[PDB]
Amino acid sequence: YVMFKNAPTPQEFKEGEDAVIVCDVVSSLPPTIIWKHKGRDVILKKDVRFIVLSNNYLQIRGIKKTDEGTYRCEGRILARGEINFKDIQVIV
DSSP states (O other), X not given: OEXXXXXXXXXXXXXXXXXXXXXXXXXXXXXXXXXXXSSSSHHHHOOTTEEEOTTSOEEEEEOOTTSOEEEEEEEEETTTTEEEEEEEEEEO
């Protein structure tokens, strides 16, 4: 299944700091979440300042004031084709 937990939508970090986007989701196990908006699928570019943690969070290194807005969490499963999501606002 997929249960969205611990995800304060409007978050806030410091300019040039190591930030993380809080978005916990209890997806089945093999699949995972997809970070969209403010980058268009970050998991496909994997810039030098984007490290998704094992708990489905997004550690943006530096978090520039121009990369803030609304990151969309997309909990997705390929075995049991599921597409859950929500808009997380990030300010910096």
